Design a protein around this ligand. Structure first.
Ligand SMILES: *[C@@H]1O[C@H](CO)[C@@H](O[C@@H]2O[C@H](CO)[C@@H](O[C@@H]3O[C@H](CO[C@H]4O[C@H](CO)[C@@H](O)[C@H](O)[C@@H]4O[C@@H]4O[C@H](CO)[C@@H](O)[C@H](O)[C@H]4NC(C)=O)[C@@H](O[C@@H]4O[C@H](CO)[C@@H](O)[C@H](O)[C@H]4NC(C)=O)[C@H](O[C@H]4O[C@H](CO)[C@@H](O)[C@H](O)[C@@H]4O[C@@H]4O[C@H](CO)[C@@H](O)[C@H](O)[C@H]4NC(C)=O)[C@@H]3O)[C@H](O)[C@H]2NC(C)=O)[C@H](O)[C@H]1NC(C)=O
Ligand SMILES: *[C@H]1O[C@H](CO)[C@@H](O[C@@H]2O[C@H](CO)[C@@H](O[C@@H]3O[C@H](CO[C@H]4O[C@H](CO)[C@@H](O)[C@H](O)[C@@H]4O[C@@H]4O[C@H](CO)[C@@H](O)[C@H](O)[C@H]4NC(C)=O)[C@@H](O[C@@H]4O[C@H](CO)[C@@H](O)[C@H](O)[C@H]4NC(C)=O)[C@H](O[C@@H]4O[C@H](CO)[C@@H](O)[C@H](O)[C@@H]4O[C@@H]4O[C@H](CO)[C@@H](O)[C@H](O)[C@H]4NC(C)=O)[C@@H]3O)[C@H](O)[C@H]2NC(C)=O)[C@H](O)[C@H]1NC(C)=O
Ligand SMILES: *[C@@H]1O[C@H](CO)[C@@H](O[C@@H]2O[C@H](CO)[C@@H](O[C@@H]3O[C@H](CO[C@@H]4O[C@H](CO[C@@H]5O[C@H](CO)[C@@H](O)[C@H](O)[C@@H]5O)[C@@H](O)[C@H](O[C@@H]5O[C@H](CO)[C@@H](O)[C@H](O)[C@@H]5O)[C@@H]4O)[C@@H](O)[C@H](O[C@@H]4O[C@H](CO)[C@@H](O)[C@H](O)[C@@H]4O[C@H]4O[C@H](CO)[C@@H](O)[C@H](O)[C@@H]4O)[C@@H]3O)[C@H](O)[C@H]2NC(C)=O)[C@H](O)[C@H]1NC(C)=O
Ligand SMILES: *[C@@H]1O[C@H](CO)[C@@H](O[C@@H]2O[C@H](CO)[C@@H](O)[C@H](O)[C@H]2NC(C)=O)[C@H](O)[C@H]1NC(C)=O
Lengths: 209, 165, 212
């Protein structure tokens, strides 16, 4: 039938850093040319807020409209499990569509972070794998990055979170570096951001032994 | 020497399997029907296809006692979910264009789009005929329609539509 | 359920293990779902590289909670037939569809790359905790089908979890397997092995040791 609504949560990194501003995003698609007006109402824990920013409708290649409303949120509100409701009204719907999102429920567990040098065997190769293990974290929302001497290293890949036997999560991040850059004795760092870390942040470093 | 005439009802010569098609023979008493240049049983003035299958495709000619044999009329039975139907392919300026996104067994279709040259030209929440009240040169092009049958996303074959000055 | 669109087909490849060890039987599973009560009859045709085969095994129609029928057909494939890259095709016919649905599975096409296996000792910081983590890094491999186990003294260790494979930025795949064990086992130190099955390994098998 009528238009459809998708309510997106904030980036987890955004909810964790003071310098950032997390947002909830409510997207309406399949809005017809006949009935193009879209009204948004937003609620935080049941009380209406009036400070959402709604963008002008954009005509898509398929000739429908797409309308987006973005609500800026407080880091603490989100992290304390407050609920965010986007209510969408449009002539082609008999009743408004309501979507509610909140942070995943459950007791936060502090991740442990470990860095692992390459296996001796990997030294015949021209590039080496530096490993960062992150384990025992809940919920699974997390950001993992790498840095060397104060500059972001981009040549890493991170596995999705994996459910561990104790109900927590673990993951591995693998930064690939030139073997000579490792043999040089650079300090490489694994940056982890999780809600249950002190200052939402921790750094574990790796270097030639 | 009056030629008999085969009329289609409803007028679409492209149909989907399971569509009903009536072929009416217009002459002037008794009737005969040829399918692919071969006699079929019916001697009724209107030959009725209850539920169309592919083998029903091809050429139909009829004749009555007071008629000579009719020109062939083509019927195309397509297999699929959707068929974009039209009264004709060629239109002149200011004519109305009426396209229909016919669905198999008339199955409820939603979130329907009519595309012109790969670009959406009209979208409906519910299956509806596409209407251009007065044709322009810029309306010619390649058209198809697509939609949702429950949750299955399906698509018609393309048709060419021309508008002349 | 209105089931407006009729049944849907899902075609699953054999388990990686099943494709690799001759002791196991690899099969491709064509399952038809959202079959209605009113048009319950489902027909299966099976094909290998375009050639029709008759050795499939179709289970009878199974009544589902959602008030639909689910109906499954399994075709046992030959071991080298899958590894050679032969296309398996399941054709599903049913009166709630205007046409048969055809699904096609085969092995991933492309140069098989051999996995590099690196066992990694637990970090110096985990060495103070009561339990430690033994890491098996498996990388550079293609295609993604792989199996990873653990052992100690040639007997299974079951206290491990493995990641899905991850597309590496060089076009190949990698994964990590984590085995958790007691700290004192490591300080002694017992000999553990990470063992891996993949088509590009000699004998489809390799094993890498980990000790103090
Ligand atoms: C005409 O053209 C327009 C424009 O192209 C087109 O719009 C597109 O329409 C489809 C719907 O038909 C819509 O699809 C949805 O996509 C979301 C995910 O979308 C993000 O990612 C895609 C790329 O993958 C990207 O294209 C989008 O822009 C969007 O990107 C996000 O944007 C936000 C803010 O802008 C950013 O903050 C994000 O960072 C950014 N993300 C990324 C990754 O880039 C999808 O929802 C997710 O699906 C995954 C799995 O597929 C879930 O794990 C995940 O949870 C879920 N997230 C959310 C928030 O729901 C939608 O799938 C949901 O709905 C489906 C039913 O339609 C259902 O099958 C799925 O299972 C899933 O269900 C939901 O599950 C969650 C729990 O997982 C429930 O809580 C929720 O209630 C469920 N919803 C239900 C049951 O309804 C869906 O695929 C596209 O986003 C539209 N594109 C754009 C640009 O807006 C029109 O269709 C065209 N019209 C016609 C007639 O052709
Ligand atoms: C009433 O109830 C009915 C049952 O009670 C219900 O039937 C269910 O319908 C839904 C669809 O509505 C089906 O959804 C499928 O599910 C598969 C995965 O199916 C397996 O895992 C499930 C758990 O996740 C199990 O529930 C299920 O039993 C299957 O289990 C496997 O079975 C095999 C043999 O039986 C066995 O060998 C396996 O060991 C076993 N278990 C597991 C864990 O695997 C989705 O899986 C896709 O599949 C592709 C290729 O196979 C994988 O590469 C993807 O990783 C995987 N996607 C994932 C994990 O997200 C499946 O495919 C998706 O299809 C949708 C569109 O249809 C897309 O959105 C997805 O992108 C994905 O599409 C595939 O993407 C692939 C990746 O590139 C690509 O290769 C494929 O080409 C592409 N395929 C298509 C078709 O586009 C889809 O979500 C359920 O499986 C049905 N359940 C059962 C029990 O049969 C019915 O719907 C209900 N009716 C109503 C009206 O409510
Ligand atoms: C049922 O199934 C069907 C079939 O699957 C499904 O249809 C598919 O829907 C998809 C989702 O809508 C759709 O994907 C989108 O497609 C359009 C493609 O059109 C593009 O046009 C671009 C330029 O526009 C035109 O330019 C020409 C000349 O330049 C002008 O003449 C016109 O006036 C017009 O302006 C064109 O550049 C682009 O090409 C693309 O890029 C390169 C270019 O070099 C090209 O080589 C590629 O082949 C590629 O096609 C297209 O042709 C497109 O706009 C969409 O854009 C993106 O959306 C992506 C994800 O949705 C994302 O990756 C991109 O970044 C971009 O997102 C941007 O916009 C969104 C807002 O929508 C915003 O969120 C985001 O931040 C970005 O700003 C996208 O690819 C498929 O095309 C379509 N498939 C088919 C076959 O039609 C139906 O929807 C389902 N149907 C029903 C009925 O329910
Ligand atoms: C009459 O002739 C047409 C040929 O134009 C036949 O239509 C074909 O039918 C077969 C199978 O029945 C299909 O494989 C083809 O795709 C059809 N072709 C076209 C162009 O539509 C029709 O079958 C013939 N009918 C009889 C009874 O002889």
């Amino acid at each position: 039938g009528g238009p459809s609504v998708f309510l997106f949560p904030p980036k987890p990194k955004d909810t964790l850093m003071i310098s950032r501003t997390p947002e909830v995003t409510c997207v309406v698609v399949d809005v017809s040319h006949e009935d193009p007006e879209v009204k948004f109402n937003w609620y935080v824990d049941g009380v209406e807020v009036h400070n959402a920013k709604t963008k002008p409708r954009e005509e898509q290649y398929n000739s429908t409209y797409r309308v987006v409303s973005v609500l800026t949120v407080l880091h603490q509100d989100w992290l304390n499990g407050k609920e965010y409701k986007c209510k969408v009204s449009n002539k082609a719907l008999p009743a408004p569509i309501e979507k509610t999102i909140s942070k995943a429920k459950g007791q936060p567990r502090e991740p442990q972070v470990y860095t692992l040098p390459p296996s001796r065997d990997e030294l015949t190769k021209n590039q080496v794998s530096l490993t960062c293990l992150v384990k025992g974290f809940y919920p699974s929302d997390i950001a993992v990055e790498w840095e060397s001497n104060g500059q972001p290293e981009n040549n890493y890949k991170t596995t999705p979170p994996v459910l561990d036997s104790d109900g927590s999560f673990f993951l591995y991040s693998k930064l690939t570096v030139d073997k000579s850059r490792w043999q040089q004795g650079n300090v490489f760092s694994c940056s982890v951001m999780h809600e249950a870390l002190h200052n939402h942040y921790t750094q574990k470093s790796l270097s030639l032994s | 020497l009056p030629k008999a005439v085969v009329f289609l009802e409803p007028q679409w010569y492209r149909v989907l399997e399971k569509d009903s098609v009536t072929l009416k023979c217009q002459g002037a008493q008794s009737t005969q029907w040829f399918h692919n240049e071969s006699l079929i049983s019916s001697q009724a003035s209107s030959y009725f296809i209850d539920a169309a299958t592919v083998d029903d495709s091809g050429e139909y000619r009829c004749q009555t006692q007071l008629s000579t044999l009719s020109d062939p009329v083509q019927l195309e039975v397509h297999i699929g979910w959707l068929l974009l139907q039209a009264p004709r392919w060629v239109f002149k300026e200011e004519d109305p264009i009426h396209l229909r996104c016919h669905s198999w067994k008339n199955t409820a279709l939603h979130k329907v789009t009519y595309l012109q040259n790969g670009k959406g030209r009209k979208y409906f929440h519910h299956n509806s005929d596409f209407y251009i009240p007065k044709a322009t040169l810029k309306d010619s092009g390649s058209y198809f329609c697509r939609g949702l049958v429950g949750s299955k996303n399906v698509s018609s074959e393309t048709v060419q539509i021309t508008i002349t000055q």
